[PDB]
Amino acid sequence: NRDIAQVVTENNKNYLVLYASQTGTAEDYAKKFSKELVAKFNLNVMCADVENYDFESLNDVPVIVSIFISTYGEGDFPDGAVNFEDFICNAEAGALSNLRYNMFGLGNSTYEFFNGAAKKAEKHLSAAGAIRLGKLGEADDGAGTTDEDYMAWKDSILEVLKDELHLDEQEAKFTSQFQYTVLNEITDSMSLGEPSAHYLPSHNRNADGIQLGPFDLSQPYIAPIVKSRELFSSNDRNCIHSEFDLSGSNIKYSTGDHLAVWPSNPLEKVEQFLSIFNLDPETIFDLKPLDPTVKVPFPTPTTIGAAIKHYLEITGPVSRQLFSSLIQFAPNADVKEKLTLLSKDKDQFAVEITSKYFNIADALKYLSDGAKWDTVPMQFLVESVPQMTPRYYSISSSSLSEKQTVHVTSIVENFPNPELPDAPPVVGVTTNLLRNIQLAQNNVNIAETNLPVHYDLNGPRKLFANYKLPVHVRRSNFRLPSNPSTPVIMIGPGTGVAPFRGFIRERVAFLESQKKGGNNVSLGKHILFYGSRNTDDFLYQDEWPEYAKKLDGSFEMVVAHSRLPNTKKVYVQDKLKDYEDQVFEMINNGAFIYVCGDAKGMAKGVSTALVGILSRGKSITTDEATELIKMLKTSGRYQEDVW
Ligand SMILES: Cc1cc2nc3c(=O)[nH]c(=O)nc-3n(C[C@H](O)[C@H](O)[C@H](O)COP(=O)(O)OP(=O)(O)OC[C@H]3O[C@@H](n4cnc5c(N)ncnc54)[C@H](O)[C@@H]3O)c2cc1C
Ligand SMILES: Cc1cc2nc3c(=O)[nH]c(=O)nc-3n(C[C@H](O)[C@H](O)[C@H](O)COP(=O)(O)O)c2cc1C
Numbered sequence: 001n002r003d004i005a006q007v008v009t010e011n012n013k014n015y016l017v018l019y020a021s022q023t024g025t026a027e028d029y030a031k032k033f034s035k036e037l038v039a040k041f042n043l044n045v046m047c048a049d050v051e052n053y054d055f056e057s058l059n060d061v062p063v064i065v066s067i068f069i070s071t072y073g074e075g076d077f078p079d080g081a082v083n084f085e086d087f088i089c090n091a092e093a094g095a096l097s098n099l100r101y102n103m104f105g106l107g108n109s110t111y112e113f114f115n116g117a118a119k120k121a122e123k124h125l126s127a128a129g130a131i132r133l134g135k136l137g138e139a140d141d142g143a144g145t146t147d148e149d150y151m152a153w154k155d156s157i158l159e160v161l162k163d164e165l166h167l168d169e170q171e172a173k174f175t176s177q178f179q180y181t182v183l184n185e186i187t188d189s190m191s192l193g194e195p196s197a198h199y200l201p202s203h204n205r206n207a208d209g210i211q212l213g214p215f216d217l218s219q220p221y222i223a224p225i226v227k228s229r230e231l232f233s234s235n236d237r238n239c240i241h242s243e244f245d246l247s248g249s250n251i252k253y254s255t256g257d258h259l260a261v262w263p264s265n266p267l268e269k270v271e272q273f274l275s276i277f278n279l280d281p282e283t284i285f286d287l288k289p290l291d292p293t294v295k296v297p298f299p300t301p302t303t304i305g306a307a308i309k310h311y312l313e314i315t316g317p318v319s320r321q322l323f324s325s326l327i328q329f330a331p332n333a334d335v336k337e338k339l340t341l342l343s344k345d346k347d348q349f350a351v352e353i354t355s356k357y358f359n360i361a362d363a364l365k366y367l368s369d370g371a372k373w374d375t376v377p378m379q380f381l382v383e384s385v386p387q388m389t390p391r392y393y394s395i396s397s398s399s400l401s402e403k404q405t406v407h408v409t410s411i412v413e414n415f416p417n418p419e420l421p422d423a424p425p426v427v428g429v430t431t432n433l434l435r436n437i438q439l440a441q442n443n444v445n446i447a448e449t450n451l452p453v454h455y456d457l458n459g460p461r462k463l464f465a466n467y468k469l470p471v472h473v474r475r476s477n478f479r480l481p482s483n484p485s486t487p488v489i490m491i492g493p494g495t496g497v498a499p500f501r502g503f504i505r506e507r508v509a510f511l512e513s514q515k516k517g518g519n520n521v522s523l524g525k526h527i528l529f530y531g532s533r534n535t536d537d538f539l540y541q542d543e544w545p546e547y548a549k550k551l552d553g554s555f556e557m558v559v560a561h562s563r564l565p566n567t568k569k570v571y572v573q574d575k576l577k578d579y580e581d582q583v584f585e586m587i588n589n590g591a592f593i594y595v596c597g598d599a600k601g602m603a604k605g606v607s608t609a610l611v612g613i614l615s616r617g618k619s620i621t622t623d624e625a626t627e628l629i630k631m632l633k634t635s636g637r638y639q640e641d642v643w
Helices: 004-010 025-039 055-060 082-090 116-127 146-164 267-277 304-311 320-324 333-344 346-354 360-368 378-384 429-441 494-515 544-550 572-578 580-588 602-618 622-635
Strands: 015-020 045-049 064-070 100-107 137-140 178-180 221-230 239-245 258-261 287-289 391-394 405-411 468-474 488-493 526-532 555-561 592-597 638-642
Touching (some): 004 045, 004 055, 015 082, 025 045, 025 378, 100 116, 100 146, 137 146, 146 320, 333 346, 333 360, 346 360, 391 405, 391 429, 405 494, 488 572, 494 526, 494 592, 494 638, 526 572, 526 580, 544 555, 592 602, 602 622, 622 638
Parallel strands (some): 015 045, 100 137, 526 555, 592 638
Antiparallel strands (some): 178 287, 221 239, 221 468, 239 405, 258 391, 258 468
8 A cells, every 4th residue: 555565566566766855856857767767678667756655665675776865954855755764764784685776866065965865865775784776866956957967877877777687778768657548528527727636626615614624735725815015116026925815724834934836837838838739728638547656647637728737847947858758759850860969968958958948848849940749649748747846935924923814925036038138038937926916916907017927817717716826834944932032143135034024023923912911021132134136126125114113122134235336245144244243142142043045155155154253253263163053053043944
C-alpha cells in the first residue's frame, strides 16, 4: 500500500526514482530522468514522491535507486518528506547494506548550506552502509545553471547505470504512463479546471456553511480577495496588497506563516500554447494510470483547455531536455535536424532559446517558423511539461489583529525582454494574476492600465467568481519571540518587509489589549531595517508612523534607498554597519534577528554584516564570529525567511 519495497516488487519495477521536492523542481527533473530511462532502456521505472510512501523496507528494495532532493531551511529536507529525512538521518551503520543508489541534489549557492539536504542525505546513506554509484550532483539555482547542471549529471549517471546494469541502449522514444482516451460528453463528474477533485459538481452545497477539512496542496480553499490596492507610485513597476477572507473555513494561521496561491496561466499565453501544437482546447479527455505506481497529475477527466490553463506550467524557462525529447515529433525533416543539434549544444540552446526568454510555445514557434507541431500527443505534454505549483507569499497581516483575514503584499514580476526588444515582457504568472484582479476588483479601466496579460477571473465554472483563487496556509517557523520583552531586530529589504508588517501589527494588537486593562507589561526594543529603490516603491510608507506611535519608544524603523538620485546606493546591510553598536547591544541583550526577503545576495550579505558587527564588537576573529552567528541560527535567535 504505502510500503516501498513492497510497492516496487509487486509492480515488477526494475528502477526506483525518488524525489523530495517542495516546489516541484526536483519532482520535475526526477520525472525527466525517469521518463528518459524508459526512453532509452524501457526500464519499468517507479518515479515516486518520497512523501507518499514508507521507507522502512528500503533495504529490501531489489533495484537501484535514484534520489532527487532539494535543500531548505538550513540543510533541511523539503517539508512533508521529513519521514524520509528522519529515517535516513537515523538508520544506523550497515543498515542499508543492500542499497545501490546515485543522487542529484538541487540547491542555490546563495544560501549557507549549499545543497545541504542532499549533502547530509548522502552522508547518512553512506554510513548506513549504502553504495553511491555516480558523482553526487549539485544543481545551483543560485547561478541559474540548474538545468544545464542536470543535463551534465544526467549524461554521466546514464553511462554508469548502463554498466552497473549491463543495459543495452536503443533510440529514444516516448512511452505514455497513461492511457489517453479522448471523450465526448462533458459530464459533471469530470473537471473543467477545479483545483482539487473535491470541488467537482458531483461532489458541497454552493451556499453551505463553514468549510472544514484540512486545506493544502491536495485540497486548497477557494478564498475571496475582499480588498486590494496598488502599493507603488511607480510607472513601470507595481506591487499588490491583497486581503483574502478565510472566515468561511476553519483555517487558523499564525503571524509569520506563508500563503500558497494557486494560479492559472495568462490567456495570451495559454492561447500561444494551444496554437503552436494546433490543439483543440475543447477536446475532452481522460488519463488511466498503467499501474498503481503512476499517479494522475490532476483532476480527470478534463478538457485540454482546462489543463493548459489550470494544470500545466506552460510558461517559464525551457528545459533543454524537452528539446531532446521532441525530435520524435518534429514537424518536418529540417526541424528534426535543428532540434537535435540544439538538444545537444549547451551554448547554442542558450543562444537560440534560453537567453531570449522563450516559453515552450514561444520556443517551438521559433524553430518551426510557425510550422505547427500537430505530431505532439497530449499524453506527451501531460508528462513532459511541469505541473503548475502554487506560489508562496509571506503573510503580511497579524493573526492576533486579523485572525480571519490574510494579507499578501506581492511585487509584480514584469520586465522587458533584454534580448528581443520587440518582444513581450517576461511576466510572472501569479503576480500579474493578482494585479489583474486588484485592477478589476477596484473598478479600473484595465484597457488603459499597463497590465501585460489577462486572466480568466471566472475560473472553472465561475468557481473563482467574486475575485477568488485557490489557497492554503503553510505553517512556518518564522515567529516573534515568546517573551514580549525580548529585543527584535528585523531586516527585510523591499518585498521582504511583509513578515515584519505582521510582526508589528501583531505586536500592536497586543500592547493594545494590555492597555485595555491587563496592565501593559513592558515591551522590548524592536528595530526594522527596511529598504527599497526610493519613495515610490516604499511599502506601506503611510502605515509605519501610525505603528511607531502605538508602540511608544519601543519601535524604530531605519530605512535605506538604493536607487536614489545623486546618492550612493545603500542596502539594509549598510544601515546595519551604520547602526552596529546599537545592533551589537540589542544582540548582547538577547535580541532576535529576522532576515526576510529575496536573497539574491541579501542572505550572505546581511549575515556577513552581522558577523562584522560581532567580530568587531567582541573583538574576535572573523571565523570565530561567523561561528557565533551559526550558533544563533541553530538556537533559533537568527531566523531566515529568504527566497
Ligand atoms: C517562502 C517564500 C516566501 C515568499 N514571499 C513573498 C512575498 O512576501 N512577496 C512576494 O512578492 N513574493 C514572495 N515570494 C516569491 C513568490 O512566491 C513568487 O516567486 C513571485 O510572486 C513570482 O510569482 P510568479 O507567479 O510571477 O512567478 P513565475 O510565473 O513562476 O515567474 C518567475 C519569474 O520568471 C520570469 N519568467 C516567466 N517566464 C519566463 C521564461 N520563459 N524565461 C525566463 N523567465 C521567465 C517571470 O517574469 C518572473 O520574474 C516568496 C517565495 C517563497 C518560496
Ligand atoms: C525558502 C527557500 C530556502 C532555500 N534554502 C536553500 C539552502 O539553504 N541551500 C541551498 O543550496 N538551496 C536553498 N534553496 C534553493 C532550492 O534548493 C532550489 O531553488 C531548488 O531548485 C528547489 O527545488 P524544489 O522546488 O523542487 O524544492 C532554497 C529555496 C527556497 C525557496
